[PDB]
Amino acid sequence: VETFAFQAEIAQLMSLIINTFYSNKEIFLRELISNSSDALDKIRYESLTDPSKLDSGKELHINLIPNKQDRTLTIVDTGIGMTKADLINNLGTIAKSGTKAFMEALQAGADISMIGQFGVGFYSAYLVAEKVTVITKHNDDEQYAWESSAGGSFTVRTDTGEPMGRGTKVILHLKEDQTEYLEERRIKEIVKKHSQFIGYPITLFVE
């Protein structure tokens, strides 16, 4: 298990998400689905130039899996996934600019729901989750587990759990007062409100 520090500006972003009083938390689901759709777009686009990129799985979809026993909401996609360098360095690097822009927009009157316009929507997970675990598999790398309870650090390790062929699974360990997002009717409402035209099938698992 390797432990890393977030870049200072991303630690600041996470603290702002965790500490700001902001009732409209449900948008976290739209931002993660949007990320999943973006990841699916990438593998699909690359597959047109190199069809062998789908040898690890042709299905392009998003599954929402609530588990009341574990108090987790899992968002599974079969997108492009993330390499180890993606997990530790690349996405963080790319996010520096968007985090800065987002912080500046909040100062000028934007609100937290607009986070996705800055390319850092993943961090909205911290509106509802005390800890987030991300399992991922990219064609060019091994399966990894990333995890963070914020506080300025994250971990990465090789994942020995069940193989996924390719994609990303975001496991939201929900805060104790955020269990509404395990309810079928609640998830259904939010997907219909915010994610109705996503161009991949979204399957809402029930319990």
Ligand SMILES: O=C1OCC/C=C/CC/C=C/C(=N/OCC(=O)N2CCCCC2)Cc2cc(O)cc(O)c21
């Ligand atoms: O695999 C994904 O993207 C790969 C292709 C890129 C697509 C653009 C949209 C993705 C935004 C993401 N931002 O993460 C920010 C970040 O530094 N982190 C550290 C590592 C763990 C994930 C979060 C990554 C991501 C998030 C997601 O909710 C679903 C996903 O399939 C992916």
